[PDB]
Amino acid sequence: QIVPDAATCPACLAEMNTPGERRYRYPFINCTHCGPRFTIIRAMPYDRPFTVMAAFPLCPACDKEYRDPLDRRFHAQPVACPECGPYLEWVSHGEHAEQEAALQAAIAQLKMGNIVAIKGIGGFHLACDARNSNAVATLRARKHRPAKPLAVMLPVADGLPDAARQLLTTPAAPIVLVDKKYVPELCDDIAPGLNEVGVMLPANPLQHLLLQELQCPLVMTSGNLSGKPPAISNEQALEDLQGIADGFLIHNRDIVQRMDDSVVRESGEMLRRSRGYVPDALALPPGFKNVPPVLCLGADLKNTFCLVRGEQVVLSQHLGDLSDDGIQTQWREALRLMQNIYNFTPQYVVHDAHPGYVSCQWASEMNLPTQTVLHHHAHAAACLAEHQWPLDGGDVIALTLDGIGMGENGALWGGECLRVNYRECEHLGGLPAVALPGGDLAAKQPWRNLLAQCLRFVPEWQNYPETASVAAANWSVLARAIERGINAPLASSCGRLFDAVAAALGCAPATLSYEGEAACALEALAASCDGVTHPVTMPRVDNQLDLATFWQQWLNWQAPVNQRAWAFHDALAQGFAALMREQATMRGITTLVFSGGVIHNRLLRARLAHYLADFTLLFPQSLPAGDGGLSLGQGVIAAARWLAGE
């Protein structure tokens, strides 16, 4: 079996740390229970000849160990030592070093407050002292990343909650999101405006060596140029990262698969499923058997593909935004190795119903019969599947909350109540559809959504303090284009509604630097409120939420900003709850499903569960609520359609 790449084991950590051992401070030590797996396989099977480690024939000393049955290194494919293995290299503006000398140069740079690019398991990282405000601001400036939170590597898990330390110390060694109150050493530029910080432990030997030496928290963010995939070769690192890093700690062991760090919450919730989980297969739900090989292309953002066959499914690693420059290459190498590993040959392809998608283009190039699944249908089905809902389980009411996904008849959805099973998706109601002014700009400039909401629902909106920056502009040009439907399509988007409220509270920059920035900011503000008595509501009118009443109560309910943000979450949860209750109860349905990237909001989840405690509630947990889980939803719907003989 090939298993995920795994965190350095305590045995290897002790060997690396003991003077006189052959692998004393060898940054490439591993054995049978730890080290890189998926990321070092060129083709099958898992044997030195077909890994990256065929380029390093074992010296006589390591040869003895490979043979020995009692040795912890019986058939450790990588193995090797400082005599025959890869070795570290350092490169920096007319400096070069190697081995221990290279390590020590990197350490000194990090101590000086500089930024170093470090070769990891599934790509490169950019690192600096997370306590040093100038270094972090310098890293942000050079990377053009003014706000998106930075991951941080801690030398030990001391002082973190039990749940976080448990998760951090697993062989997967994910980044775990933790209240930043627990980590006061970090500067404010790590996760500015947010309540959580993603922390991680050293999980390869080079990281261990570094942290033992530095004894402090280090930024440890992806070594990518913005709008580009992480570099996996030395050459690409050195080219992409030359204007960002002050030095490079690299090495001559190739990486053959891109494999980002995984991200989970301390709660257990999966956010990004990569290193340490891939390529583990998942069992399909009861009733799903003898399924033909289907390739599911997933979503254009936060992409994963899925391979469905027999009674199992295997997701790819996080591949990111499919319009990034060079991502198709990484996607295709992932699919090549994944097909090799599972001896998998697709007979069918499933992709999203949106004809504008990149993924949809790639499907047409395949020469297999193709089929289409509605975005939000796939979100709901991926949740049902994670909960092992049987093939013949019966209908649920689903709430699918995200930015924008294409719905029935070309509509733009993102705030929908649906009747769902594995074959059918009936649209029942949800948020009203409201223009996206300036098209793609509406996701980058929250105020555009406040304007759209105000022109639809808010009499005399120019008189409220919270619309002041919009009201003072020449907004009528844009209002005229909205009215005429010029690059102003309607979308029933939960994401855009959060953006309109964050624009009204001033809690995000006027123009965002990352997708969902304003929504995260608004959730972070709300989360600082313990709960408040307030009069804001979102009443049901027929099958839609009455936003005119929401806005009038919300704009006129003065309160500390954190209470205003909490009241929005509570009112939204209560309005969708009333909708889903009406719809489920009058259909004899007892189970509700929640999915879509907005369902990553923990406060909304808490409020929905509070209001809907009279139902069985299904929320995502081990796959992401967002687009990273979409390929699995497409897979089970394709499977169910086939199993029904359609």
Footprint of Mg ion (CB under 5 A): 159, 182
Count of all residues that appear for the chain in the document: 646
Q: Which of 354, 387 has the CB closer to ligand AMP?
A: 354
Check if the beta carbon of residue 377 is closer than 8 Å to that of residue 345: no
| 194 touching Zn ion, by CB under 5 A | no
Which secondary-structure segment (H or E) carries 129?
strand 124-129
Long-range residue pairs from 179-186, CB within 8 A, at least 24 positions apart, any chain: 183/152, 183/154, 183/217, 185/130, 185/131, 185/216, 185/217, 186/130, 186/131, 186/152, 186/217
DSSP characters over 302-322:
SB--EEEEETEEEEPPP-B-T
Q: What does 498 bind: ligand AMP, Mg ion, Zn ion, none (CB cut-off 5 to 8 Å by kind)? A: ligand AMP
Q: Which of 301, 547 has the CB closer to ligand AMP?
A: 301
H-helix segments, 431-472: 446-457, 468-471
* Number of shown-chain residues binding Zn ion (CB under 5 A): 13
Q: Which of 596, 635 has the CB closer to ligand AMP?
A: 596
The beta strands (E) that lie in 312-453 are given as 312-315, 348-352, 370-373, 396-406, 412-420, 425-430, 434-435
Residue 613 to residues 395, 422, 535, 543, 605: CA-CA distances in angstroms? 19, 24, 22, 21, 12
Least distance to ligand AMP, CB of residue 114, Å: 33
The one segment of 23-31, 253-261, 440-448, 494-502 that binds Zn ion by CB under 5 A: 23-31
List the structure tokens of 454: 């105000």
Check if the beta carbon of residue 571 is closer than 8 Å to that of residue 536: yes
Q: What does 359 bind: Zn ion, ligand AMP, Mg ion, none (CB cut-off 5 to 8 Å by kind)? A: none
Q: What does 598 bind: Zn ion, Mg ion, ligand AMP, none (CB cut-off 5 to 8 Å by kind)? A: ligand AMP
- Tokens 């499923």 correspond to 273
List the structure tokens of 512: 């965002």
| 495 touching ligand AMP, by CB under 6 A | yes
Q: Which of 262, 601 has the CB closer to ligand AMP?
A: 601
Rounded (10°) CA dihedral 487, 489, 491, 495: 0
| 516 touching ligand AMP, by CB under 6 A | yes
| 570 touching ligand AMP, by CB under 6 A | no
Residues near 347 by beta carbon (within 8 Å), at least 6 away in sequence: 292, 293, 294, 368
C-beta nearest to ligand AMP: residue: 597
Q: How far apart are CA 407 and CA 604, in angstroms?
A: 23
The one segment of 97-105, 171-179, 216-224, 516-524 that binds ligand AMP by CB under 6 A: 516-524
Q: Which of 257, 634 has the CB closer to Zn ion?
A: 634
Q: Which of 515, 582 has the CB closer to ligand AMP?
A: 515
Q: Which of 598, 636, 637, 643 binds ligand AMP (CB under 6 A)?
A: 598
Residue 386 to residues 231, 266, 300, 618: CA-CA distances in angstroms? 32, 19, 21, 9
* Number of shown-chain residues binding ligand AMP (CB under 6 A): 18
Least distance to Mg ion, CB of residue 180, Å: 10
- Tokens 């391979």 correspond to 307
The one segment of 59-67, 282-290, 446-454, 598-606 that binds ligand AMP by CB under 6 A: 598-606
| 523 touching ligand AMP, by CB under 6 A | yes
Q: Which of 60, 184 has the CB closer to Mg ion?
A: 184
Q: Which of 59, 163 has the CB closer to Mg ion?
A: 163
Q: What does 182 bind: ligand AMP, Mg ion, Zn ion, none (CB cut-off 5 to 8 Å by kind)? A: Mg ion
| 627 touching ligand AMP, by CB under 6 A | yes
Q: Which of 52, 53, 62, 639 binds Zn ion (CB under 5 A)?
A: 62
3-state helix, strand, coil in the chain (%, to 5): 35, 20, 45
Q: How far apart are CA 574 and CA 163, in angstroms?
A: 30
Q: What does 159 bind: ligand AMP, Zn ion, Mg ion, none (CB cut-off 5 to 8 Å by kind)? A: Mg ion
Q: Which of 31, 454 has the CB closer to Zn ion?
A: 31
| 59 touching Zn ion, by CB under 5 A | yes
Binding track, positions 284-313, relative to ligand AMP; x by CB under 6 A:
-----------------xx-----------
> Which residues is 270 bridged to in the sheet?
264
Q: Which of 169, 372 has the CB closer to Mg ion?
A: 169
* Contacts to ligand AMP by CB under 6 A: 301-302, 402-403, 495, 498, 515-516, 519-520, 523, 596-598, 600-601, 626-627
* Contacts to Zn ion by CB under 5 A: 9, 12, 31, 33-34, 59, 62, 81, 83-84, 402, 405, 627
